[PDB]
Amino acid sequence: KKILIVDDEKPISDIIKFNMTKEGYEVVTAFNGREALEQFEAEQPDIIILDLPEIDGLEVAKTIRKTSSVPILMLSAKDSEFDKVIGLELGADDYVTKPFSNRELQARVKALLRRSQ
Amino acid sequence: KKILIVDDEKPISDIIKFNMTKEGYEVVTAFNGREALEQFEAEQPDIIILDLPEIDGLEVAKTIRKTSSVPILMLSAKDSEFDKVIGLELGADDYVTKPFSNRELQARVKALLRRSQ
């Protein structure tokens, strides 16, 4: 029920926030890696959408994984095999490219929650 | 450690089998939906790659979900929002389009296993 949206672009954060809210999730937002870790610690989200700075997203996921198995769905405009592979290896549970379907993304957050209880 | 590859195309099954074997997984194969359910029941795989017949894959996943939370990674040449969304809603944990990166796909099976223990 609580999603932390980590996104350095306010337009995209706003759209994901809107759509997650319409689904009935409680939404917290962060706009850089420091805020992401702070919100993760303070709010203890059930899932994180991570969309960050050219490596900060990877470090955020890395850092969270030291202490927590919270599902991380990484989002990114980078779509190469290396990018996807490295995101997952560093602890993302899923990696979705930008631009994305609002749906699917709803369906992927549901699948992740279903699988993490 | 045991993967059931459900694929009606022997060339693709062979490639996934080869690559999963190189990773150290035990591989069982099925080539239609009936075989998929039979192998699922008899072999109790730790994960299923499901790549089937225009709805049989969806029914296979549906049927398995009546009894089991085993991770299902659906694979398909169909790449539309509807296709991805419906696969996940019917119980797939992930959906990867064809053609796929042998890597990533290795990384996605690992992420799924990591998340399912």
Side-chain angles (χ1 to χ4, degrees), chain A residues 60-75:
Chain A
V60 168
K62 201 183 143 290
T63 293
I64 284 165
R65 276 290 171 268
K66 300 197 202 250
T67 52
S68 179
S69 55
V70 65
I72 294 171
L73 187 157
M74 282 195 46
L75 278 183

Side-chain angles (χ1 to χ4, degrees), chain B residues 6 30-40 52 56 60:
Chain B
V6 180
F31 302 91
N32 53 224
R34 170 198 289 150
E35 297 173 6
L37 296 169
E38 284 177 347
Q39 290 298 152
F40 160 65
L52 274 358
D56 283 4
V60 168

Side-chain angles (χ1 to χ4, degrees), chain B:
Chain B
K1 227 187 309 101
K2 183 189 296 185
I3 308 185
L4 196 204
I5 300 167
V6 180
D7 206 304
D8 49 354
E9 320 196 82
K10 181 117 210 293
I12 299 283
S13 183
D14 282 351
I15 279 149
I16 301 167
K17 179 172 192 190
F18 170 82
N19 288 125
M20 297 299 138
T21 291
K22 295 280 303 204
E23 272 311 283
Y25 294 121
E26 181 177 6
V27 173
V28 303
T29 46
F31 302 91
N32 53 224
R34 170 198 289 150
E35 297 173 6
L37 296 169
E38 284 177 347
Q39 290 298 152
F40 160 65
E41 295 182 349
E43 296 283 350
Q44 300 178 324
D46 300 288
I47 181 161
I48 304 176
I49 294 175
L50 178 62
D51 175 28
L52 274 358
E54 207 231 322
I55 32 187
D56 283 4
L58 297 172
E59 267 293 287
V60 168
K62 201 183 143 290
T63 293
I64 284 165
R65 276 290 171 268
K66 300 197 202 250
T67 52
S68 179
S69 55
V70 65
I72 294 171
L73 187 157
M74 282 195 46
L75 278 183
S76 192
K78 297 179 146 188
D79 61 351
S80 79
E81 163 195 287
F82 173 108
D83 293 316
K84 281 165 175 192
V85 173
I86 195 83
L88 296 165
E89 290 296 223
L90 277 153
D93 297 285
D94 199 352
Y95 188 114
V96 174
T97 57
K98 290 207 294 195
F100 55 88
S101 155
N102 281 337
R103 304 250 149 91
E104 176 174 14
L105 171 65
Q106 275 167 358
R108 286 188 180 277
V109 165
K110 297 157 129 170
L112 268 185
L113 289 170
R114 187 204 303 146
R115 280 253 61 129
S116 300
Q117 128 201 233

